[PDB]
C-alpha cells in the first residue's frame, strides 16, 4: 500500500503533545473562543453594511466584469433562490466615482425574478481618466419601498489600457 511514512519530526511532535497536552487544549479553546468572537463581529458588521452578495428574502447576486480597453461590460448575474415564489419589486443602484467611470444608467428596475433562473443584467462601464486609475464600484439591490439595500456587491475595475 501507499501508507505514509513518519520522520523524527512526527515522534518529537507527539512527545511534545503527550507531555504538554493540557496547555495545547486550553490555548486552542481560548483561540477558538476568540475566533468565534471575531467571526460574529465581522458577520454583524457585514449585516450592518449589507455587503453580503448572498443574503425569508431569498436572493443571490454576483457581478462579472469583461473586457480590456476603456469600455468594460459589467454583467450582474442575479438569481431568486426559493422553492416557488417570485420577487416583484426590486431595483439595482450603482455607486461609482463619477470622475472615473461613466455609467449610462446607474439605476434600473429588475425583471420579475422567477425562482431558479440566472438573470444576466449587463451595463457598459467606461473609464474616463486619461491615466490608469482602478476604483471600486458598488452595486446595491434593494426593494422599491425600502431604503436599506437588500444586498450588495463590489467590483474592482481593472486598468483602462486607454489611448
Amino acid at each position: 500500500l501507499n501508507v505514509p511514512r513518519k520522520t523524527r519530526l512526527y515522534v518529537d511532535q507527539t512527545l511534545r503533545e503527550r507531555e504538554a497536552g493540557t496547555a495545547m487544549h486550553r490555548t486552542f479553546q481560548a483561540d477558538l473562543y476568540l475566533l468565534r468572537l471575531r467571526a460574529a463581529r465581522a458577520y454583524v458588521q457585514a449585516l450592518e453594511s449589507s455587503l453580503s452578495p448572498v443574503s425569508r428574502e431569498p436572493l443571490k447576486l454576483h457581478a462579472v466584469v469583461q473586457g480590456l480597453g476603456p469600455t468594460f461590460k459589467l454583467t450582474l448575474h442575479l438569481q431568486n433562490t426559493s422553492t416557488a415564489r417570485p420577487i416583484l419589486g426590486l431595483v439595482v443602484c450603482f455607486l461609482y466615482n463619477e470622475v472615473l467611470y461613466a455609467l449610462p444608467r446607474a439605476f434600473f428596475k429588475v425583471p420579475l425574478l422567477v425562482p431558479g433562473l440566472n438573470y444576466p443584467l449587463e451595463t457598459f462601464v467606461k473609464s474616463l481618466s486619461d491615466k490608469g486609475i482602478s476604483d471600486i464600484i458598488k452595486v446595491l439591490v434593494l426593494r422599491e419601498g425600502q431604503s436599506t439595500p437588500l444586498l450588495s456587491a463590489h467590483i474592482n475595475m481593472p486598468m483602462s489600457e486607454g489611448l
Binding site: 504538554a20 463581529r41 458577520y43 449585516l47
Partner: protein, 436 residues
C-alpha cells in the same frame, strides 16, 4: 534565536548623523599589543569617536572628539615616517590628518584620558572621495596612502608628503579603490563597468595592466591576502558578487537576488576557500563559502561597512554600523527555539466581557434572521423640473440622478452633494425635452 544576530555591546551614535563606508575601522590604534581591537567611527558630520567596548556602559566610549570639517574613511595604519606603531588617518573632503591616540591611565577606571595629537596634515587641492593604504611597491614597515578624487584623480602620499598624483584614464563617477599587494596593483571599478588593475610603478611613471567588464558598477572592492596559497580579489557589485583571479578573469561569481550594501571576506576555514559575509538592504547577513551560503542572520539595521574582530576576549565578533547612527557588536544566534504556545497561567481569557459582547453580536445575528425626504415638482411651462431633498440626520456622499425614458432627454443627469448638516434643504433644477 536561530538565524538572528544576537546582541553584544551596542549603541546609537549621535543626533541624526550620517556615515558611509570607511567610517567603521577596527584595529589597535592604541598600540597596546594585546590583540583586542577598538572601534573607530567618524561621520561626515564631524565627530570622531573611539570605543573599547565591554559586554550602554559609560566608560566604553574612549573619546568623542569633534573636528570642524567632515570625516571620510577613517583608517588605521603605519602612517608615520619614523616608527612601526599604528596611527589613525582621517580624510576630510579637502584635508588629510594623521593622528595618534595615546591613552594615559589614572588610579581609577575612569581616571584615564586619551589624547589625539596632530602628527601631520595635508591640504588637498582636489576634493577627496575615498582612499586606500598599503605598502606600495615592495616596501615594508610603511603604509603609504593613495587617496582618490571625486573627479577621477588619484594622489599618492609616501606616508610623509605629496609623493605624486595621476589622473585615472576615463572615469566620471569615482568607484571603490583598493590595492593588491600580491600583484602591487591599484584596482578600481570605473564608471564604464570596467574593473581595472594598474601596476603601481606604471602609475608612478606617468597604462592599464588589465581590465574586466563586469555587468555593473561595484559598491566595494576588498583585496584580501591572509592566504598565501591562491590569491584572489573580491568585487561586490550592486547586482552581483565576483571573486576574480590575479591575472584578471573571474574565478567565480554569484548572482545575488538582493541589494548588497557591504561585504567583508574574513578569515577562512577550508583549504583554498574564503569565507565571506555580505549585508543586504533587506537587513540580513549572508555567510558564503565563496559561492555557497553557510549561514544567514537577521540584522537590526541596514549594515554599512561591517567588520569582524576580537573584542574583549571573544574572537570573531561582528561589528556593524548603520548610516543613520546605529552601531552594534553581535554574535550569531544558534538556538533553535521550540515553536510552542507560551504557558501563561496568569493571563486568562476574560469570559465575562467577551461573553457579553458575543451575546450582543449573536443577538443581532439571530434577530435579523426573522432620514431623507425627496420631492419633485414639475413646472406648468422643454419643461423645467425642480427636485428638493431635505435630510433629518446629517448625511454624506449624496448622489441624485434622474431617469425619464429613452426618447425624453434631460439637460442634467447627475448631481453630487457632499456632507450636509441636519435640517438643510437642497434644490436642483433640470429641463426635460423630447428628442426623437
Amino acid at each position: 534565536s536561530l538565524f538572528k544576530a544576537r546582541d553584544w555591546w551596542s549603541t546609537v551614535l549621535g543626533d541624526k548623523e550620517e556615515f558611509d563606508q570607511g567610517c567603521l575601522c577596527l584595529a589597535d590604534v592604541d598600540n597596546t599589543g594585546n590583540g583586542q581591537d577598538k572601534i573607530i567611527v567618524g561621520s561626515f558630520m564631524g565627530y570622531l569617536r573611539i570605543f573599547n567596548p565591554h559586554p550602554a556602559q559609560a566608560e566604553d566610549l574612549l573619546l568623542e572628539v569633534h573636528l570642524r570639517d567632515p570625516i571620510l574613511q577613517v583608517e588605521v595604519g603605519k602612517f608615520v615616517s619614523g616608527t612601526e606603531m599604528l596611527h589613525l588617518a582621517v580624510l576630510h573632503s579637502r584635508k588629510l590628518c594623521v593622528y595618534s591616540v595615546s591613552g594615559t591611565l589614572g588610579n581609577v577606571e575612569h581616571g584615564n584620558q586619551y589624547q589625539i595629537k596632530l602628527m601631520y596634515e595635508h591640504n588637498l587641492q582636489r576634493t577627496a572621495c575615498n582612499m586606500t593604504y598599503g605598502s606600495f611597491g615592495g616596501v615594508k614597515g610603511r603604509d603609504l596612502i593613495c587617496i582618490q578624487s571625486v573627479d577621477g584623480m588619484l594622489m599618492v602620499f609616501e606616508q610623509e608628503s605629496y609623493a605624486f598624483g595621476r589622473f585615472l584614464p576615463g572615469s566620471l563617477l569615482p568607484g571603490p579603490l583598493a590595492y593588491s599587494s600580491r600583484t602591487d596593483s591599484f584596482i578600481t571599478v570605473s564608471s564604464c563597468h570596467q574593473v581595472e588593475s594598474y601596476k603601481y610603478q606604471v602609475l608612478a611613471f606617468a597604462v592599464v595592466d588589465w581590465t574586466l567588464n563586469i555587468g555593473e558598477q561595484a559598491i566595494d572592492i576588498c583585496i584580501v591576502s591572509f592566504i598565501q596559497s591562491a590569491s584572489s580579489v573580491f568585487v561586490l557589485g550592486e547586482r552581483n558578487f565576483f571573486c576574480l583571479k590575479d591575472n584578471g578573469q573571474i574565478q567565480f561569481m554569484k548572482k545575488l537576488d538582493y541589494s548588497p550594501s557591504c561585504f567583508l571576506p574574513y578569515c577562512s576555514v577550508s583549504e583554498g576557500t574564503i569565507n565571506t559575509l555580505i549585508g543586504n538592504h533587506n537587513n540580513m547577513l549572508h555567510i558564503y563559502q565563496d559561492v555557497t551560503l553557510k549561514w544567514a542572520t537577521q540584522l537590526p539595521h541596514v549594515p554599512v561597512a561591517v567588520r569582524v574582530g576580537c573584542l574583549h576576549d571573544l574572537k570573531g565578533v561582528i561589528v556593524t554600523l548603520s548610516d543613520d547612527g546605529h552601531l552594534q557588536c553581535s554574535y550569531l544566534g544558534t538556538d533553535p527555539s521550540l515553536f510552542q504556545a507560551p504557558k501563561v497561567e496568569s493571563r486568562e481569557l476574560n469570559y465575562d466581557e467577551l461573553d457579553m459582547e458575543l451575546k450582543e453580536l449573536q443577538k443581532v445575528i439571530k434577530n435579523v434572521n426573522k432620514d431623507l425626504k425627496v420631492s419633485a415638482m414639475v413646472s406648468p411651462n422643454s419643461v423645467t423640473v425642480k427636485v428638493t431633498l431635505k435630510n433629518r440626520v446629517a448625511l454624506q456622499k449624496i448622489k441624485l440622478s434622474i431617469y425619464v425614458q429613452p426618447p425624453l432627454v434631460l439637460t442634467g443627469d447627475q448631481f453630487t452633494f457632499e456632507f450636509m448638516a441636519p435640517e438643510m434643504t437642497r434644490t436642483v433644477g433640470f429641463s426635460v425635452y423630447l428628442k426623437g
